[PDB]
Amino acid sequence: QEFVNKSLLFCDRNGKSFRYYLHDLQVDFLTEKNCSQLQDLHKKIITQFQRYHQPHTLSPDQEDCMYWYNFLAYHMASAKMHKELCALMFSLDWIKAKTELVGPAHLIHEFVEYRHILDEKDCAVSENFQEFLSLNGHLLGRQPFPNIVQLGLCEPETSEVYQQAKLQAKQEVDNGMLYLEWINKKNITNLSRLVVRPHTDAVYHACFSEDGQRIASCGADKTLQVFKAETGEKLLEIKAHEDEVLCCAFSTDDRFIATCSVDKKVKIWNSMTGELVHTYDEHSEQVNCCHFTNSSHHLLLATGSSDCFLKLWDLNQKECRNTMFGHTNSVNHCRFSPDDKLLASCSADGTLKLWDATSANERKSINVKQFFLNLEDPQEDMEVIVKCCSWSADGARIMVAAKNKIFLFDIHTSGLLGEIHTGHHSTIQYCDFSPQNHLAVVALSQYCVELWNTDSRSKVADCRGHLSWVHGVMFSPDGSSFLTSSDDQTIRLWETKKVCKNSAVMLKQEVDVVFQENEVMVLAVDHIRRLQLINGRTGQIDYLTEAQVSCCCLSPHLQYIAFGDENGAIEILELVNNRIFQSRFQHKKTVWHIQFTADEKTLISSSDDAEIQVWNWQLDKCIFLRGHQETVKDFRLLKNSRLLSWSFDGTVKVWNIITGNKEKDFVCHQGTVLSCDISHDATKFSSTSADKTAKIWSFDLLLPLHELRGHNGCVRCSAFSVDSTLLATGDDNGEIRIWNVSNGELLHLCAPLSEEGAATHGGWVTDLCFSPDGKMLISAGGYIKWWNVVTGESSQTFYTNGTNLKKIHVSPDFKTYVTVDNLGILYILQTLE
């Protein structure tokens, strides 16, 4: 207070609190005036602090709680005590606290900046930390929270973070904690450089600042979020619109950011404060394209929309400089050339237009008729719909893609310079051209992204990265790297040089697992043609070759391999003699469920139609179960020779195998039936749960014995316990309720959520597996979390890398685990001894 009273200190009175500060120059003065006393001060307060509270003890309840995390490393660094800085920051406890109190971006920034501060070995370690930290930032700031300590165990063996955490895990006794060792961790996960998730809602547009300093993104959350490209630290939180923000872009100087949205308003915000600077609104429909002039010389704003008009706005004015009309369809995209005098417009109608901004008059029109495809289709030649429209380095040419081909148009001659054919024959939905190596990134369709070298006209690599449909792809301001963003709202940073390389590291999502007693085999669709049956725990990759099968099934006692196809017909190949095979044509749509009878012969199959095929292969006899239901949803062989099947009709019928004979006929639901399960033991009981309630039955009566009405929000799935006496059901939100199968009751709702204190489950559940003990219920979904039957959880540990685990396949030893996430990453897990 005296310092303030002497002009030596400034005071921001935060209500009842007094946050003291210095101005920039006021700090600079002492910075120079003071010498080595400063390092002594740095070292002093380190010891003194530890004499009072430990930096890890340091709880968020303190006033100085974040102080020491924001500055202690700074003190040690300034002090040039690299041994103390090493001891401080190479710590999962330090990281944990700092990331729960302050956040991970500053931390990462330090591990980077301190690379020139630390010793050689230390830098090598810190680099392990630089990669380590890419693992988190997913759970940080959200629930559940990551256990930074255990997170270390996910690092490569090579990594110091792993070796430290793993040795420490070995040092720390009996910690029930339970960890799994991922055996082929080293062969799987093509880890991208950076994972960014900027919005809780759908992301619609994102881009780099001209400076390359920051990234702006906007979307369905109705706001503008801008964050530092280096650290990810959020810079601007601007509640830009009252409706979903369709696109947004930087001005020349990065001094303004304009957003254009569903509300049909064009708003230019000061990037500094986020206050409205200019606002424009003439379009009738929602605005599709907004782009600033590139050069600072002319100040024009181009917009275009679904209303098929273009509007040239004078940034100097509040009004439109000129309304430009002339497209025949809706306008999809628009870009200023580097030459501020030319504006290129791209639209649905397959024309490129060149507009002279000086006169606001149409200069030339390019009719993109260069894709020539004469189909049998009586209609005229394949109409060309131009999509991505990007400028060449020159600015005189536009690289566009449409249909099956990439075209290079010269805006000055309106002629065609290049023509590249792309992958097969589909329609290119999104694309962009790389400034280097004449590469082009073509997101063809259904998140298939192909990297091609134009001019060379040769495919370079299959870019895998997202399960969901890729929404946008854009290049770093250097052009040295680029990032992809999909519907999974995950931005993944990729190094172009790495993308150009081929890789077997990750698998396709279509995988399955067969445990053969002592050994485990993983069935996985091959990168290209058919599939590889990979015997795990050995190299033995056995590639099978074919016309590209859709699914496979092993017969009892093996000796036969069966596979389905889009044609619906199934072919069974004898394994004793690979020249003998049988196939009897049936089914219109792709075949669905495939399963052999109890015996090694006779194959039962179903599809989209109303009948279940009993195919007595070798004789090719077709006996049909004429259910005459809308569609056979699925079926499963029961223990006796009975056959359990259901449709979406809300019906569950019980047939005989071999010879169709619907002995029992249950009508359980009013709608879609999603699966059905059996009591396992014998088959005394069997039940259902689907978009309604969970009814259970004994088969003897045609009607169900009891209806579990517990969930009003409609039950989604269910599964019997392994013989015990329990029936678990899953709710819309993944709430798992355990019911006791004794005619029917109201048993506990165990669904541990919260809950970062130890990890909330993420929500929803994709699979259930009761422990052999009958005491725990393993729940799988975002990740695997062990719950306790009736109240409580258990192993809170082992966070999976990806999400949406599909089918958990537990080894019969209940010692190893094989599963697959949404990324197609193969989990080969062995319980850590």
Add this chain to the structure above:
Amino acid sequence: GDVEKGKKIFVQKCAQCHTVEKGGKHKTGPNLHGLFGRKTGQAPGFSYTDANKNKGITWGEETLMEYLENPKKYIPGTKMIFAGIKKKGEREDLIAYLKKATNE
């Protein structure tokens, strides 16, 4: 079907690609105003796949019930990315909402 339950389903699973009101803009998918009684792929100003445009059926309660259960099966080659709605009741509710919302 229950119109209110269908509205929730639409908002949750369709709205991001479709508008239902008259004059509603096309998005990833076509505006659906006037859907009932119209043939496939006829909304003006939207680039449908030839598969869609050639299906040749008329949209109504029955055709929608089948299409929404499995879009790709009913119209092979469609560019509509949606797995389908398994539950009969949910499709009934959604269709009831569409019958109202695309006609107001």
